[PDB]
């Protein structure tokens, strides 16, 4: 019921010369075009301070456009580049925006446009958002068209900084025009979660404290922070992926059902469950920093020449959560994220309860695993009678590998899906301001405690190991029952 952007839409990518723009934003715009979801009358404008030409931009991004049909669809590559142009100018001053206002109004007149449709993708750090947002609002805002601006996380590093950014942003652009990106919300398997649970009685009837023993959201990466240790030092793993990506996923797994079809009904339920989270217990935590591999082949986090040697930076964290409402009361929830472990994986693991006594209880807990990445899949640990004369249980792993169906369909990348959604005006996969506020109210006390003077020292774990010491115990302390 929001207006869709199709013909004669102008997409301006601010920060167009940067890494994010050339490796992600423009490649995503192309993928949408290559598969027929970007209208050919779309004007794509890259804006940045440097003084490059239309040729420079096109040749800068060309190495990153994806050709899944190989040398085929090469006309599409050149087709797309021909829709892309460049304008140089400062973010700090009105002359660039007035010059841009002229390029755009020229195009919106050469095509008979009664209602300008303008998307501004801000591929910039927040310290430059507010300037550009001011300038767009002072110079390039039409009360007789519709404009939408995309910004990407982070929006702050704690409650105070996030509040300050939003205080400056709110008088410039409303929630309806703002599209705040957490790119996990564009991943195919993350987008399936709501319909998977709410659309299937076989899961929804069990999705409650009466049947769930343990909820886990799991993030593992096999590499470390080498080279960028000094930057990561003020971030840490909790800020990097847990406060945003992992919290988003958990929110989709625990919210109640949206009662209407408005995208804001999705967002209302996410905010609602966020407010029911109890405060984080600062003791119910497992904090780790990666040391040298047992190998000797891999450096410690501190071996990084850009990291001070007394650094308490957390590169692995497991955190317990509790949600105080009727569905979740007393269910222990764990989010755990680490760099420099043994594999790359993002995964949801839900363990169901067993009855304590009776005939079909000498049997392992049912379990549901949803792999978000790498190999999108759903697995169910099930129980069944042994076929034939035998009257014993055997546990069966049911495979719902999505590779079956995906070799048939076009599965967009996160940014492709997300830009599409913005063009269609659908806020379902974007962060709202109260969502941001509550998520920072939840994590800031933990972050203040860890980074203050009494901040605990992370336990060291070797690069490449499965789990820091204490993890398996931590999980069993949070309702996970291990089995054969
Ligand atoms: O899992 P994805 O889609 O590759 O995203 C993971 C990355 O997400 C970013 O937000 C983090 O800052 C990175 O540290 C992390 O590696």
PDB file of C-alpha atoms in Angstrom, residues 285-453:
ATOM      1  CA  UNK A 285      28.478 -14.772  30.311  1.00  0.00           C
ATOM      2  CA  UNK A 286      31.391 -16.587  28.658  1.00  0.00           C
ATOM      3  CA  UNK A 287      34.010 -14.250  27.226  1.00  0.00           C
ATOM      4  CA  UNK A 288      37.063 -15.221  25.190  1.00  0.00           C
ATOM      5  CA  UNK A 289      39.964 -13.802  23.168  1.00  0.00           C
ATOM      6  CA  UNK A 290      41.815 -15.861  20.598  1.00  0.00           C
ATOM      7  CA  UNK A 291      45.402 -16.917  21.219  1.00  0.00           C
ATOM      8  CA  UNK A 292      47.904 -18.689  19.020  1.00  0.00           C
ATOM      9  CA  UNK A 293      46.861 -21.946  17.372  1.00  0.00           C
ATOM     10  CA  UNK A 294      48.021 -25.236  18.888  1.00  0.00           C
ATOM     11  CA  UNK A 295      49.639 -25.559  15.442  1.00  0.00           C
ATOM     12  CA  UNK A 296      51.785 -22.555  16.098  1.00  0.00           C
ATOM     13  CA  UNK A 297      50.742 -21.603  12.554  1.00  0.00           C
ATOM     14  CA  UNK A 298      48.273 -18.860  13.567  1.00  0.00           C
ATOM     15  CA  UNK A 299      48.873 -15.656  15.540  1.00  0.00           C
ATOM     16  CA  UNK A 300      47.150 -14.608  18.709  1.00  0.00           C
ATOM     17  CA  UNK A 301      44.835 -11.625  18.666  1.00  0.00           C
ATOM     18  CA  UNK A 302      47.656  -9.745  20.444  1.00  0.00           C
ATOM     19  CA  UNK A 303      50.295 -10.716  17.853  1.00  0.00           C
ATOM     20  CA  UNK A 304      48.588  -8.104  15.665  1.00  0.00           C
ATOM     21  CA  UNK A 305      50.958  -5.159  15.394  1.00  0.00           C
ATOM     22  CA  UNK A 306      47.992  -2.756  15.636  1.00  0.00           C
ATOM     23  CA  UNK A 307      46.701  -4.137  18.984  1.00  0.00           C
ATOM     24  CA  UNK A 308      48.053  -3.012  22.348  1.00  0.00           C
ATOM     25  CA  UNK A 309      49.380  -5.907  24.381  1.00  0.00           C
ATOM     26  CA  UNK A 310      47.060  -5.323  27.372  1.00  0.00           C
ATOM     27  CA  UNK A 311      43.926  -5.513  25.194  1.00  0.00           C
ATOM     28  CA  UNK A 312      40.854  -7.048  26.841  1.00  0.00           C
ATOM     29  CA  UNK A 313      38.990  -7.190  23.510  1.00  0.00           C
ATOM     30  CA  UNK A 314      36.389  -9.967  23.317  1.00  0.00           C
ATOM     31  CA  UNK A 315      36.538 -12.014  20.101  1.00  0.00           C
ATOM     32  CA  UNK A 316      34.198 -14.743  21.418  1.00  0.00           C
ATOM     33  CA  UNK A 317      31.135 -14.278  23.618  1.00  0.00           C
ATOM     34  CA  UNK A 318      28.324 -16.507  24.844  1.00  0.00           C
ATOM     35  CA  UNK A 319      25.489 -14.649  26.593  1.00  0.00           C
ATOM     36  CA  UNK A 320      22.419 -15.962  28.398  1.00  0.00           C
ATOM     37  CA  UNK A 321      19.082 -14.251  27.871  1.00  0.00           C
ATOM     38  CA  UNK A 322      15.663 -14.485  29.469  1.00  0.00           C
ATOM     39  CA  UNK A 323      12.383 -13.193  28.088  1.00  0.00           C
ATOM     40  CA  UNK A 324       9.741 -12.452  30.708  1.00  0.00           C
ATOM     41  CA  UNK A 325       6.461 -13.179  28.986  1.00  0.00           C
ATOM     42  CA  UNK A 326       3.931 -15.973  28.811  1.00  0.00           C
ATOM     43  CA  UNK A 327       5.478 -17.813  25.844  1.00  0.00           C
ATOM     44  CA  UNK A 328       9.108 -17.748  26.996  1.00  0.00           C
ATOM     45  CA  UNK A 329       9.138 -17.460  30.774  1.00  0.00           C
ATOM     46  CA  UNK A 330      12.005 -19.513  32.166  1.00  0.00           C
ATOM     47  CA  UNK A 331      13.330 -20.741  28.797  1.00  0.00           C
ATOM     48  CA  UNK A 332      17.118 -20.216  28.814  1.00  0.00           C
ATOM     49  CA  UNK A 333      18.290 -18.498  25.618  1.00  0.00           C
ATOM     50  CA  UNK A 334      21.932 -18.371  24.515  1.00  0.00           C
ATOM     51  CA  UNK A 335      23.518 -16.239  21.815  1.00  0.00           C
ATOM     52  CA  UNK A 336      27.108 -17.170  21.070  1.00  0.00           C
ATOM     53  CA  UNK A 337      29.474 -15.661  18.505  1.00  0.00           C
ATOM     54  CA  UNK A 338      33.184 -16.119  17.829  1.00  0.00           C
ATOM     55  CA  UNK A 339      35.932 -15.351  15.359  1.00  0.00           C
ATOM     56  CA  UNK A 340      38.949 -17.613  14.772  1.00  0.00           C
ATOM     57  CA  UNK A 341      37.099 -20.845  15.499  1.00  0.00           C
ATOM     58  CA  UNK A 342      37.120 -24.107  13.499  1.00  0.00           C
ATOM     59  CA  UNK A 343      34.433 -23.306  10.890  1.00  0.00           C
ATOM     60  CA  UNK A 344      32.144 -20.699   9.383  1.00  0.00           C
ATOM     61  CA  UNK A 345      28.501 -21.123  10.306  1.00  0.00           C
ATOM     62  CA  UNK A 346      25.388 -19.236  11.337  1.00  0.00           C
ATOM     63  CA  UNK A 347      22.876 -21.549  12.919  1.00  0.00           C
ATOM     64  CA  UNK A 348      19.727 -21.737  15.061  1.00  0.00           C
ATOM     65  CA  UNK A 349      19.353 -24.707  17.406  1.00  0.00           C
ATOM     66  CA  UNK A 350      16.166 -25.413  19.329  1.00  0.00           C
ATOM     67  CA  UNK A 351      15.911 -28.342  21.743  1.00  0.00           C
ATOM     68  CA  UNK A 352      12.472 -29.585  22.747  1.00  0.00           C
ATOM     69  CA  UNK A 353      11.372 -31.014  26.080  1.00  0.00           C
ATOM     70  CA  UNK A 354      10.951 -34.664  26.967  1.00  0.00           C
ATOM     71  CA  UNK A 355       8.256 -36.099  29.213  1.00  0.00           C
ATOM     72  CA  UNK A 356       9.840 -37.309  32.440  1.00  0.00           C
ATOM     73  CA  UNK A 357       8.105 -40.697  32.780  1.00  0.00           C
ATOM     74  CA  UNK A 358       6.217 -43.223  30.677  1.00  0.00           C
ATOM     75  CA  UNK A 359       6.619 -45.424  27.640  1.00  0.00           C
ATOM     76  CA  UNK A 360       7.996 -43.149  25.031  1.00  0.00           C
ATOM     77  CA  UNK A 361      10.409 -41.143  27.173  1.00  0.00           C
ATOM     78  CA  UNK A 362      13.480 -43.434  27.147  1.00  0.00           C
ATOM     79  CA  UNK A 363      14.183 -41.495  23.976  1.00  0.00           C
ATOM     80  CA  UNK A 364      16.271 -38.437  23.018  1.00  0.00           C
ATOM     81  CA  UNK A 365      14.877 -34.914  22.848  1.00  0.00           C
ATOM     82  CA  UNK A 366      13.587 -33.675  19.540  1.00  0.00           C
ATOM     83  CA  UNK A 367      15.745 -30.943  18.124  1.00  0.00           C
ATOM     84  CA  UNK A 368      15.422 -28.433  15.301  1.00  0.00           C
ATOM     85  CA  UNK A 369      18.426 -26.916  13.523  1.00  0.00           C
ATOM     86  CA  UNK A 370      18.085 -24.118  10.958  1.00  0.00           C
ATOM     87  CA  UNK A 371      21.314 -23.417   9.053  1.00  0.00           C
ATOM     88  CA  UNK A 372      21.325 -19.883   7.710  1.00  0.00           C
ATOM     89  CA  UNK A 373      24.752 -20.213   6.097  1.00  0.00           C
ATOM     90  CA  UNK A 374      26.650 -21.768   4.424  1.00  0.00           C
ATOM     91  CA  UNK A 375      24.307 -24.510   3.162  1.00  0.00           C
ATOM     92  CA  UNK A 376      20.766 -23.232   3.848  1.00  0.00           C
ATOM     93  CA  UNK A 377      18.966 -26.194   5.423  1.00  0.00           C
ATOM     94  CA  UNK A 378      16.558 -27.359   8.109  1.00  0.00           C
ATOM     95  CA  UNK A 379      17.185 -30.531  10.137  1.00  0.00           C
ATOM     96  CA  UNK A 380      14.834 -32.269  12.573  1.00  0.00           C
ATOM     97  CA  UNK A 381      15.987 -34.897  15.025  1.00  0.00           C
ATOM     98  CA  UNK A 382      13.071 -37.341  15.200  1.00  0.00           C
ATOM     99  CA  UNK A 383      12.148 -40.656  16.770  1.00  0.00           C
ATOM    100  CA  UNK A 384      10.628 -43.709  15.183  1.00  0.00           C
ATOM    101  CA  UNK A 385      10.128 -47.389  15.777  1.00  0.00           C
ATOM    102  CA  UNK A 386      12.794 -49.624  14.292  1.00  0.00           C
ATOM    103  CA  UNK A 387      11.248 -51.263  11.193  1.00  0.00           C
ATOM    104  CA  UNK A 388      10.126 -54.868  11.485  1.00  0.00           C
ATOM    105  CA  UNK A 389      10.080 -57.265  14.438  1.00  0.00           C
ATOM    106  CA  UNK A 390      12.328 -55.016  16.500  1.00  0.00           C
ATOM    107  CA  UNK A 391      10.517 -52.822  18.988  1.00  0.00           C
ATOM    108  CA  UNK A 392      13.138 -50.206  19.831  1.00  0.00           C
ATOM    109  CA  UNK A 393      13.500 -46.532  19.077  1.00  0.00           C
ATOM    110  CA  UNK A 394      15.905 -45.227  16.543  1.00  0.00           C
ATOM    111  CA  UNK A 395      16.536 -41.558  16.084  1.00  0.00           C
ATOM    112  CA  UNK A 396      16.205 -40.200  12.578  1.00  0.00           C
ATOM    113  CA  UNK A 397      17.632 -36.997  11.109  1.00  0.00           C
ATOM    114  CA  UNK A 398      15.180 -35.493   8.617  1.00  0.00           C
ATOM    115  CA  UNK A 399      16.889 -33.412   5.915  1.00  0.00           C
ATOM    116  CA  UNK A 400      15.064 -30.488   4.356  1.00  0.00           C
ATOM    117  CA  UNK A 401      18.000 -29.359   2.255  1.00  0.00           C
ATOM    118  CA  UNK A 402      16.926 -26.263   0.382  1.00  0.00           C
ATOM    119  CA  UNK A 403      19.466 -26.860  -2.412  1.00  0.00           C
ATOM    120  CA  UNK A 404      16.723 -29.077  -3.880  1.00  0.00           C
ATOM    121  CA  UNK A 405      14.482 -26.128  -4.712  1.00  0.00           C
ATOM    122  CA  UNK A 406      17.137 -23.419  -5.100  1.00  0.00           C
ATOM    123  CA  UNK A 407      18.761 -24.904  -8.218  1.00  0.00           C
ATOM    124  CA  UNK A 408      15.361 -23.969  -9.766  1.00  0.00           C
ATOM    125  CA  UNK A 409      14.876 -20.417  -8.436  1.00  0.00           C
ATOM    126  CA  UNK A 410      16.919 -17.210  -8.391  1.00  0.00           C
ATOM    127  CA  UNK A 411      18.124 -16.646  -4.818  1.00  0.00           C
ATOM    128  CA  UNK A 412      19.159 -12.986  -4.454  1.00  0.00           C
ATOM    129  CA  UNK A 413      21.968 -11.764  -2.256  1.00  0.00           C
ATOM    130  CA  UNK A 414      21.030  -9.884   0.916  1.00  0.00           C
ATOM    131  CA  UNK A 415      21.578  -6.431  -0.566  1.00  0.00           C
ATOM    132  CA  UNK A 416      19.707  -7.358  -3.742  1.00  0.00           C
ATOM    133  CA  UNK A 417      16.699  -8.471  -1.707  1.00  0.00           C
ATOM    134  CA  UNK A 418      16.926  -5.412   0.526  1.00  0.00           C
ATOM    135  CA  UNK A 419      17.209  -2.767  -2.200  1.00  0.00           C
ATOM    136  CA  UNK A 420      14.257  -4.397  -3.950  1.00  0.00           C
ATOM    137  CA  UNK A 421      12.233  -4.153  -0.725  1.00  0.00           C
ATOM    138  CA  UNK A 422      13.142  -0.470  -0.403  1.00  0.00           C
ATOM    139  CA  UNK A 423      12.072   0.196  -4.000  1.00  0.00           C
ATOM    140  CA  UNK A 424       8.736  -1.421  -3.103  1.00  0.00           C
ATOM    141  CA  UNK A 425       8.458   0.632   0.107  1.00  0.00           C
ATOM    142  CA  UNK A 426       8.289  -2.437   2.411  1.00  0.00           C
ATOM    143  CA  UNK A 427       9.816  -1.747   5.848  1.00  0.00           C
ATOM    144  CA  UNK A 428       9.517  -5.396   6.982  1.00  0.00           C
ATOM    145  CA  UNK A 429      13.250  -6.136   6.732  1.00  0.00           C
ATOM    146  CA  UNK A 430      14.577  -2.824   8.091  1.00  0.00           C
ATOM    147  CA  UNK A 431      15.271  -1.592  11.629  1.00  0.00           C
ATOM    148  CA  UNK A 432      12.882   0.875  13.231  1.00  0.00           C
ATOM    149  CA  UNK A 433      13.943   3.629  15.615  1.00  0.00           C
ATOM    150  CA  UNK A 434      12.293   2.118  18.720  1.00  0.00           C
ATOM    151  CA  UNK A 435      13.771  -1.258  17.758  1.00  0.00           C
ATOM    152  CA  UNK A 436      17.199   0.395  17.750  1.00  0.00           C
ATOM    153  CA  UNK A 437      16.546   2.177  21.028  1.00  0.00           C
ATOM    154  CA  UNK A 438      15.436  -0.945  22.909  1.00  0.00           C
ATOM    155  CA  UNK A 439      18.247  -3.078  21.528  1.00  0.00           C
ATOM    156  CA  UNK A 440      20.798  -0.536  22.789  1.00  0.00           C
ATOM    157  CA  UNK A 441      19.062  -0.249  26.187  1.00  0.00           C
ATOM    158  CA  UNK A 442      19.534  -4.024  26.477  1.00  0.00           C
ATOM    159  CA  UNK A 443      23.214  -4.296  25.515  1.00  0.00           C
ATOM    160  CA  UNK A 444      24.700  -1.044  26.811  1.00  0.00           C
ATOM    161  CA  UNK A 445      24.938  -2.139  30.488  1.00  0.00           C
ATOM    162  CA  UNK A 446      26.767  -5.321  29.494  1.00  0.00           C
ATOM    163  CA  UNK A 447      29.072  -3.321  27.217  1.00  0.00           C
ATOM    164  CA  UNK A 448      29.748  -0.673  29.882  1.00  0.00           C
ATOM    165  CA  UNK A 449      30.577  -3.413  32.381  1.00  0.00           C
ATOM    166  CA  UNK A 450      32.965  -5.286  30.075  1.00  0.00           C
ATOM    167  CA  UNK A 451      34.772  -2.154  28.861  1.00  0.00           C
ATOM    168  CA  UNK A 452      34.969  -0.384  32.215  1.00  0.00           C
ATOM    169  CA  UNK A 453      37.839  -0.646  34.685  1.00  0.00           C
TER     170      UNK A 453
END
